[PDB]
Amino acid sequence: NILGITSKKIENFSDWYTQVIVKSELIEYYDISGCYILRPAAYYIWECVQAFFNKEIKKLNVENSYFPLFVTKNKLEKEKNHIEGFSPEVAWVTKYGDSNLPEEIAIRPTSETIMYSVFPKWIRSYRDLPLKLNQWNTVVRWEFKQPTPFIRTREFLWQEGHTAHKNEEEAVKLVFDILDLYRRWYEEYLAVPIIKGIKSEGEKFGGANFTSTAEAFISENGRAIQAATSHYLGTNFAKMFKIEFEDENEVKQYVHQTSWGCTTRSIGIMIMTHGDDKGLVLPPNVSKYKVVIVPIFTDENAIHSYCKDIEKILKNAQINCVYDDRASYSPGYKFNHWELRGIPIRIEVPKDLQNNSCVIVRRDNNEKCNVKKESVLLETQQMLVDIHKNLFLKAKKKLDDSIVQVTSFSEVMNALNKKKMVLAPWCEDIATEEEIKKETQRLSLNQSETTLSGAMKPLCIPLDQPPMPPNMKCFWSGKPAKRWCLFGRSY
Ligand SMILES: O=C(NC1Cc2ccccc2C1)c1nccnc1NC(=O)N1CCC(NC(=O)[C@@H]2CCCN2)CC1
Ligand code: PRO
After folding, report:
1. What H or E segment, with its residue span, contains residue 314?
2. For L-proline, which residues are the binding ones?
């Protein structure tokens, strides 16, 4: 029992998340705060979604590349609105060994200024457009807020795409094309539902025209979290970096640029969504070992021979599996050993050999059933798909039951204290965002996230807008509201 999870997911969600990521061999802690080690089980998930996202962006003619880790002061402060948001979190290298550098250099929090410093040399005519680039790297944002593995780290793996188009229509089209790819990223591989929306003016990317987002929600602690982002930068970065091109009428024009990113935070959202009191729970598309086979003891040689036959037919069908034949541990140990590591299927094998069958157990609901030997391949093929849809449909229902539509403010704190979001009519005035955050944080006297702010913030203006009444006013200012917006506590 001590080798398993000792904290229930409902009781202590913070301690539960720490035990799950450690005992499943996903995360190892480090002697630098905010930095964590991705063990092979965690990095394998990253390679899976990386192989999917690569194949999809090649269809859009996006090409991979790598740009330097460092940036000078001259290039970093080109755009005013972009550096003002990143300035206190930018890490600076100031010396080599014991000798100071002739000029200080900064570690990339994002590669806008690094990549766009050389775009004018690549973009000179309309023939050089569209320019589409992507990187798979890490960036460093040295914040002093409470770190959490995967989702809130000072260094994080991600991809960052950067495109440049001839007009606004072509760039905005790619923004929402990428945004839907992020939806397939979370749905088809992590089984996590998301909400597409537009960020408010006070929550959009520095130097961007608008920011499209994919929002997720953690229902155990009532915290939303941005799953991915896709910005339409317009001509803002093109003006400060002088990224011009001569059009087909011999007139100089600014390019319409986009930037979009999705990090390993996607892995943490998956853990908080499907993890249970038994440990990690993994969708099949991001799990290395699909099935685990545990013997139960007469004739020991007959059980070893029978268990290896299932591992043979499973590996023949391109389904990687593992047979835990460790004689130093009981089956009960092996049961909890792989349930903590998120193995989707366990096949248990003396009476089963006499019946020429085996006990196939699911990880999501622990539903066991007898399956004959010759009919175990097809039964395990479909159970993988059924486990993936069950994890997504259950997560979709918990997401739907998390949004509460409100028309005033006297019903907002009740929904927040119920671990819910709120869909309220809003005038979208940027001045009201700080007013709502300060007031909701003041009224938050009953939380127990001691490291997360009790304030609620504008999450996103959902693309799926419900009908708007003619005289519906703003829930905060009372002015004529414009659209519905999602508010709530976030990561
Ligand atoms: O951001 C991260 N770390 C920071 C450093 C640190 C250090 C300690 C504690 C917190 C943080 C925070 C991050 N970390 C691990 C994995 N992924 C990450 N990023 C993302 O998932 N990204 C997509 C959402 C983007 N959100 C915004 O730009 C905000 C939201 C609206 C207004 N602007 C950020 C990029
Ligand atoms: O950090 C961001 O939000 C944008 C998107 C990826 C590159 N820069």
Report:
1. helix 300-316
2. 141, 231
Alpha-carbon span 172 to 480, nearest angstrom? 28
Annotated ligand binding at 231? The verdict is yes
Residue indicated by tokens 């929904």: 415
Give the residue carrying structure tokens 């290395």: 288
Q: Which residues lie with the beta carbon below 6 Å from any ligand 2 atom?
A: 110, 112, 160, 205, 229, 231, 259-261
| Whole-angstrom distance, CA of residue 109 vs CA of residue 119 | 19
Ligand 2 geometric centre to CA of 259 (Å): 6
User: By the 8 A CB rule, do 7 and 15 touch?
Assistant: yes
Q: Which amino acid is at 312?
A: K
Distance 233 CA to ligand 2 centre (A): 10
Which of 382, 350, 280, 403 shows the shortest CA–CA distance to 24? 280
Taking alpha carbons only, the member of 425, 426, 418, 424 closest to residue 401 is 418
Q: Which ligand is nearest to the CA of 197?
A: 1
CA dihedral 488, 218, 148, 414 (to 10 degrees): 40
* Tokens representing residue 30 in the block: 């480090």
- Considering just the CA atoms, what is the radius of gyration of the chain in Å? 26
Question: Which residues lie closer than 8 Å to 370 by C-beta, 6 or more apart?
Answer: 352, 355, 357, 358, 359, 360
For residue 432, the Cα-to-chain-centroid distance in whole angstroms is 28
Q: State how far the Cα of 57 lies from the Cα of 63, in Å rounded to an integer.
A: 8
Resolution (A): 2.3
Position 309: which residue type? D
Q: Which atom of ligand 1 is nearest to the CA of 264?
A: 16
For residues 463-487, b (16+ Cβ closer than 10 Å) or e, as one string? eeeeeeeeeeebbbeeeebbebbbb
* The pairing of beta strand 210-218 with beta strand 291-294: unpaired
DSSP 381-446: HHHHHHHHHHHHHHHHHHHHTTEEE-SSSTTHHHHHTTT-EEEEEE---THHHHHHHHHHHHS---
Q: What distance in Å separates the CA atoms of residue 366 and residue 140, rounded to the nearest whole number? A: 41
The burial class, CB within 10 Å (0-12 / 13-18 / 19+), for 51 is: exposed
* 436: Cα within 13 Å, side-chain hemisphere: 30
Q: φ and ψ at 180, to 5 degrees?
A: -75, -30
CA of 258 to the centre of ligand 2 (A): 9
Q: Is 451 in the pocket of ligand 1 (CB under 6 A)?
A: no
Task: Specify burial of residue 386 (Cβ count, 10 A radius: 0-12, 13-18, 19+).
Answer: exposed
Helices (H), 60-167: 73-76, 80-86, 112-116, 119-122
CA of 5 to the centre of ligand 2 (A): 36
For the chain, the farthest-separated pair of C-alpha atoms sits apart, in whole angstroms, at: 87
